[PDB]
Design an enzyme around this catalytic site. Structure first.
Site, mmCIF file in Angstrom:
data_model
loop_
_atom_site.group_PDB
_atom_site.id
_atom_site.type_symbol
_atom_site.label_atom_id
_atom_site.label_comp_id
_atom_site.label_asym_id
_atom_site.label_seq_id
_atom_site.Cartn_x
_atom_site.Cartn_y
_atom_site.Cartn_z
ATOM 1 N N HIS A 70 0.865 -1.191 0.000
ATOM 2 C CA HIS A 70 0.000 0.000 0.000
ATOM 3 C C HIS A 70 0.897 1.235 0.000
ATOM 4 C CE1 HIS A 70 -3.323 2.710 1.324
ATOM 5 N NE2 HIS A 70 -2.360 3.293 2.015
ATOM 6 N N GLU A 71 1.939 1.209 0.821
ATOM 7 C CA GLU A 71 2.860 2.361 0.910
ATOM 8 C C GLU A 71 3.778 2.434 -0.293
ATOM 9 O OE1 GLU A 71 0.936 3.861 4.175
ATOM 10 O OE2 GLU A 71 2.431 4.860 2.886
ATOM 11 N N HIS A 130 2.067 4.164 -3.064
ATOM 12 C CA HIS A 130 2.015 5.626 -3.081
ATOM 13 C C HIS A 130 3.182 6.172 -3.883
ATOM 14 C CE1 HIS A 130 -1.311 6.617 -0.482
ATOM 15 N NE2 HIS A 130 -0.784 6.082 0.618
#
Ligand SMILES: [Zn+2]
Length: 883
Positions: A655-656, A659
Site C-alpha cells: 500500500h505504501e 504511493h
C-alpha cells in the site's frame, strides 16, 4: 588524569573519550559565556555612550550577522531583531560591517548616525571609541567610490586623507594605512583569507554593503574574513527594520551582550534547576504519538535549544572540524559538555518522573559534533542499539565501494557503518557532475517518542545533518551513536556511479541484490553475516527499494511469518513484494523481459514499452523498520516507517510502496483516489498469493456489493452521473469509501481478462495503462500523440491531481477506450465520473463501438473465478450473490 586535565586536553583535540564530569564542563562554559558578555558590553557601552542610536538603512540593504560568537558581535539591532551592522574582533583585529553604504547617507537619511559613526571610526583606528583620530589619517578605499566615502567620513567630523593606495592587496599600503574601507567592487586573490590576514596584522576594516537588498558573493567573502555573515535572501526588503531614536544605551548594550548566547540555560545546567512544573495535561495524542506544543513555556525552551543545534550543525554541514578553527571555545565547551552528559545518560526517562535527567538530556541530544578526529561513544543506546553496535569491528584499511545513483536526487546506502566513538575517514571520487554529502542513519524525528510516558529511550536526533563533501577531499567523522552510512546526492545523472573510499568503518549485514545478476552468493553472504549476529542494524538494497532495519525486527518477521526460513523471506521480499510492484507498473527492469502478452500488445500498438528514456526505474523508495515510527505504528513518506517488522506479503508494505508509484493521470477525481489508485499494488499481490501459495489475504478489501448499492441508487436520480458522484466520490475524507472506490479499479481487470479470454491476463490492463501514461507524460508530443490515441490534442494534456480537475478522469477514459477498442463512456457515467468535452470528442474520433454499461460483481476480493458480469444498460439487476 583528573577530569580537569582531561577537559583541558579535549579542548584542543576534541577527544572527549574519558570526560564524564559534565558539571565541571558546565562551570567552564558559565565563565566563558560571562567573559564574552563582559567584553561585548564594555565595548558597546563605550561606543554608544548617550549618543543617538537612530539608524535606518531602508529596504535596500542587507542584514550583517555575527558568525563566530566568541569574537564578533552586533552593533545595530533593529526593533524587529534584525542585525543591521556587526563588529569584529576576529584574530585580534578591529572590523565593522554595515548592510548598506551608510557613508553616503551621513548628510541625509542618517545624519543622526554621524556622531556614533565617528566613535566607531575612532574605535577602528585607535582601539578606543573616545580617542580622537589624527588630522589627515590615511584611509584606503577599495571597491566603493573613494571621494564619496571620504566625504562621508568628513561629514561625521573626521579629517581623513586619501592613502592613495590599495590596502587590501598591497601589504606596504596596509602597513601605513589607518583604515581600509571596502565595498563589493573589490578585487583580490583569496579574498576571505586576505581580509583575515589584514585584520590579524592590525589594519582596521570598515565594510559597507554596496548592492542594496541584493546579495553579493564578494561581500559574503569579505564578511567571512571578518567572521561575519550576510543575512538571507531579500535583505531588509520586507521588514524594513531600523533602530529608532528612542533606543536607549542600556537596551542596546543588553541585546548585544545577549545576542546568540544563553546564560540562563547555562545557569540552569550548572545548578540543575530544571523545571518541575510543566503542565503536561496540555499535551495531546494523535494515533498514539504524544506531542506537547501547547504546554506553556515548552516551545520557547525547545526553540532556545534549537539555536544551539543550529549553531553546531552549521559546522557539521560544512564538514568543518570545530577544534581546528581558532576562536571557537564557547562552542567547543558546549560540545564537550554534551559528550560528557552522554556518558551518564540512562534510559528510559519520563517527562514527569525524571524532570532533571529528561531536560538535561533534551539539551545534550541537540549538540552533536560529527566532524572530528576523536570523541566519545554514548554509553547507553537504549531502544536504538546495544552491545553489538558498541563492539562492531572496524576496518583498519581503506575500503573502496562503487555506488549507482538511480535518479538525479536522493540518498543511497553506502553499505558500511560508523561505529560509536570510532573515527572514520571518508571520501568520494569519480562523481561526475553530482553534488555529494554523507549522512548517518535514516530515522525521522517523530520516532523518538520522548513526550510519551516513559518513552524517552533513545536520542532525539539519530539522523545526522548531511555533511557536504568535495570530490577527492577526505573528512574524518566520529559519531557518538554509530550509524548506517548514506550517500546523499543531487544533480546526478540517473545510472551514473560514484566511488566511495572509507577507512575505519564497520560492516553491518548488507544485502545488495545486483540488478539482473545471479544473487545466490550475495544471499548466502548476507545470511552468514546475520548468523554471526555482530550488528543491531542491517540494510537491504533490491532494485529501487532500500530497507534500513533493526535486526531484531527482521528476525521477528522471519520467525513469525516464515518459521525461521530466511531464504524464503528474502526471495519473497525480492519477488512477491518488490518485483511484483515494479513489474505491474511496467518499468524497464534490467534483464527481465516483458511477458508475452505485454510484448504482443505493445508491438501491436506500435509503442515504445522498453526504453530507459520513458520507462526507467524511478528513484529509490526507502523503508525504515524500527521500534518506533514518525507517526502511529507506521507512516507514509520516503522513507516510510514500519514498527511491526517487514512482511513481504503484507498489505501495508505494498500500500505504501504503491504511493510512490501513483501518477495523477490514473487517479479518478484526483485526491479522491489518493488512497485508491495505490491499492492496485497490494490487490495484485494478494491475487497472486492466493493463486501461487494459497494464503487468502485481505479478501474483503474490494466492496463490490456496496459500490453496487451506491451506483444503483445514484443512477436513479435526474442527473444519474451526478447522483453516483455524490454517493461515491464526493466525500473528501482521507479513507472515505475506500472499499467501494477500489471496486472501480478492478472492473477493468475483470473486463480485460474476458477480452483476452484468459484469467491470468486481467492485471495487464494496469501495466498497459502505466506504459501508456508514461508515454503521454514524456514522449515528444507531436511525434507520438497519434499512437497514444491523442491525435486531436494540440498539446500534451494536464497532470493535475486536484479533485476538481478532469485530467485523471480523462486520461483513464482515453487510455481504457484506446486499449480496449470500445467507447467506455457509458461505464464511466455509471460510476459518476465526469470527463472534459475535449476527451469526449477524442473518444468519439476513435470510431469504436460503444461498450454498454457493465458491472463486475464478486463476493470475495482475491478469487476471480466467481465474478459475475451484470449488464447495466437497461436497468439495474439484483445483486447476484446471496446475503
Ligand atoms: Zn496510504
Amino acid at each position: 588524569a583528573t577530569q580537569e586535565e582531561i577537559l583541558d586536553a579535549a579542548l584542543v583535540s576534541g577527544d572527549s573519550s574519558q570526560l564524564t564530569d559534565s558539571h565541571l564542563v558546565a562551570l567552564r562554559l558559565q565563565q566563558q559565556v560571562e567573559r564574552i558578555r563582559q567584553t561585548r558590553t564594555q565595548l558597546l557601552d563605550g561606543l554608544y555612550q548617550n549618543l543617538s542610536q537612530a539608524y535606518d538603512p531602508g529596504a535596500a540593504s542587507m542584514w550583517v550577522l555575527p558568525a563566530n560568537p566568541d569574537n564578533t558581535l552586533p552593533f545595530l539591532i533593529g526593533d524587529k531583531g534584525r542585525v543591521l551592522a556587526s563588529l569584529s574582533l576576529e584574530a585580534g583585529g578591529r572590523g565593522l560591517a554595515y548592510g548598506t553604504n551608510v557613508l553616503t547617507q551621513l548628510s541625509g537619511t542618517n545624519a543622526a548616525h554621524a556622531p556614533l559613526l565617528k566613535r566607531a571610526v575612532q574605535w577602528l583606528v585607535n582601539g578606543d571609541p573616545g580617542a580622537a583620530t589624527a588630522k589627515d589619517f590615511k584611509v584606503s578605499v577599495v571597491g566603493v567610490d573613494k571621494t564619496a566615502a571620504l566625504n562621508g567620513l568628513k561629514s561625521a567630523g573626521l579629517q581623513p586623507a586619501d592613502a592613495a593606495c590599495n590596502a587590501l592587496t598591497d601589504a606596504s599600503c596596509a602597513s601605513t594605512s589607518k583604515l581600509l574601507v571596502l565595498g563589493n567592487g573589490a578585487s583580490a586573490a583569496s579574498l576571505s583569507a586576505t581580509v583575515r590576514a589584514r585584520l590579524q596584522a592590525g589594519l582596521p576594516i570598515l565594510f559597507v554593503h554596496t548592492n542594496g537588498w541584493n546579495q553579493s558573493s564578494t561581500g559574503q567573502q569579505i564578511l567571512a574574513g571578518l567572521g561575519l555573515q550576510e543575512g538571507p535572501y531579500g535583505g531588509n526588503y520586507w521588514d524594513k527594520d531600523r533602530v529608532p531614536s528612542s533606543r536607549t544605551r542600556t537596551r542596546s548594550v543588553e541585546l548585544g551582550g545577549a545576542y546568540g548566547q544563553d546564560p540562563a540555560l547555562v545557569q540552569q545546567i550548572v545548578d540543575g534547576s530544571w523545571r518541575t512544573d510543566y503542565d503536561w495535561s496540555k499535551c495531546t495524542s494523535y494515533v498514539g504519538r504524544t506531542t506537547c506544543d501547547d504546554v506553556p513555556g515548552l516551545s520557547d525552551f525547545s526553540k532556545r535549544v534549537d539555536v544551539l543545534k543550529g549553531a553546531l550543525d552549521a559546522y557539521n554541514q560544512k564538514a568543518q572540524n570545530l577544534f581546528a578553527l581558532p576562536g571557537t571555545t564557547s562552542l567547543r565547551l558546549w560540545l564537550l559538555w554534551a559528550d560528557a552528559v552522554r556518558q551518564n545518560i540512562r534510559y528510559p526517562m519520563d517527562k514527569a518522573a525524571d524532570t532533571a535527567r529528561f531536560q538535561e538530556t533534551f539539551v545534550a541530544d541537540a549538540i552533536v559534533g560529527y566532524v572530528r578526529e576523536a570523541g566519545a561513544a554514548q554509553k547507553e543506546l537504549g531502544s536504538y542499539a546495544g552491545q553489538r553496535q558498541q563492539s562492531m569491528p572496524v576496518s583498519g584499511s581503506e575500503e573502496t565501494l562503487t555506488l549507482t545513483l538511480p535518479s538525479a536526487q536522493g540518498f543511497t546506502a553506502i553499505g558500511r557503518m560508523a561505529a560509536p566513538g570510532k573515527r572514520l575517514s571518508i571520501r568520494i571520487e569519480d562523481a561526475g557532475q553530482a553534488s555529494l554529502a554523507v549522512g548517518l542513519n535514516t530515522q525521522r524525528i517523530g520516532s523518538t517518542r520522548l513526550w510519551n510516558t516513559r518513552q524517552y529511550d533513545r536520542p532525539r536526533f539519530l539522523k545526522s545533518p548531511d555533511i557536504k563533501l568535495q570530490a577527492n577531499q577526505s573528512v574524518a567523522l566520529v559519531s557518538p551513536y554509530g550509524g548506517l552510512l548514506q550517500l546523499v546526492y543531487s544533480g546526478a545523472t540517473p545510472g551514473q556511479t560514484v566511488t566511495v573510499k572509507v577507512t575505519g568503518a564497520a560492516s553491518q549485514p548488507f544485502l545488495d541484490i545486483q540488478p539482473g545478476e545471479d544473487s545466490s552468493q550475495a544471499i548466502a553472504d548476507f545470511i552468514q553475516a546475520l548468523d554471526a549476529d555482530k550488528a543491531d542494524w542491517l540494510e537491504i538494497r533490491s532494485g529501487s527499494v532500500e530497507v534500513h532495519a533493526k535486526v531484531e525486527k527482521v528476525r521477528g518477521s522471519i520467525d513469525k511469518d516464515y518459521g525461521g526460513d530466511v531464504q524464503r523471506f528474502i526471495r519473497e521480499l525480492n519477488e512477491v513484494f518488490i518485483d511484483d510492484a515494479y513489474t505491474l507498473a511496467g518499468f524497464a527492469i534490467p534483464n527481465q523481459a516483458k511477458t508475452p502478452a505485454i510484448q504482443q500488445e505493445c508491438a501491436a500498438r506500435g509503442w515504445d514499452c522498453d526504453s530507459e528514456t520513458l520507462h526507467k526505474l524511478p528513484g529509490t523508495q526507502h523503508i525504515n523498520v524500527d521500534q518506533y515510527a514518525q507517526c502511529g505504528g507506521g507512516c507514509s513518506g520516503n522513507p516510510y516507517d514500519q514498527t511491526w517488522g517487514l512482511n513481504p506479503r503484507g498489505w501495508g508494505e505494498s500500500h505504501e510502496l504503491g504511493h510512490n508509484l501513483q501518477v495523477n493521470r490514473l487517479k479518478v477525481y484526483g485526491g479522491r483516489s489518493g488512497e485508491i489508485s495505490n491499492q492496485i499494488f497490494p490487490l495484485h499481490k494478494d491475487w497472486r498469493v492466493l493463486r501461487e501459495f494459497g494464503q487468502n489475504l485481505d479478501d474483503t478489501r474490494v466492496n463490490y456489493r456496496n459500490a453496487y448499492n451506491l451506483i444503483v441508487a445514484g443512477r436513479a436520480e435526474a442527473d444519474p452521473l451526478a447522483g453516483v458522484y455524490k454517493r461515491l466520490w464526493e466525500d473528501p475524507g482521507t479513507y472515505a469509501l475506500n472499499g467501494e472506490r477500489m471496486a472501480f479499479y478492478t472492473q477493468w481487470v475483470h473486463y480485460w481478462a474476458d477480452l483476452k479470454n484468459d484469467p491470468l491476463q486481467g492485471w495487464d490492463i494496469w501495466t498497459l495503462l502505466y506504459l501508456h501514461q508514461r508515454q503521454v507524460d514524456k514522449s515528444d508530443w507531436d511525434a507520438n500523440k497519434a499512437a497514444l490515441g491523442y491525435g486531436t490534442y494540440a498539446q500534451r494534456p494536464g497532470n493535475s491531481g486536484d479533485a476538481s480537475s478532469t485530467d485523471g478522469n480523462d486520461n483513464l477514459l482515453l487510455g481504457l477506450s484506446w486499449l480496449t477498442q470500445r467507447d467506455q463512456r457509458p461505464t464511466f457515467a455509471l460510476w459518476g465520473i465526469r470527463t472534459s468535452a475535449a476527451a469526449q470528442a477524442q473518444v468519439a474520433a476513435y470510431g469504436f463501438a460503444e461498450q454498454p454499461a457493465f458491472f463486475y460483481a464478486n463476493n470475495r476480493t482475491n478469487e476471480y473465478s466467481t465474478v459475475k458480469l451484470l449488464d447495466m444498460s437497461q436497468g439495474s439487476p439484483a445483486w447476484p450473490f446471496p446475503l
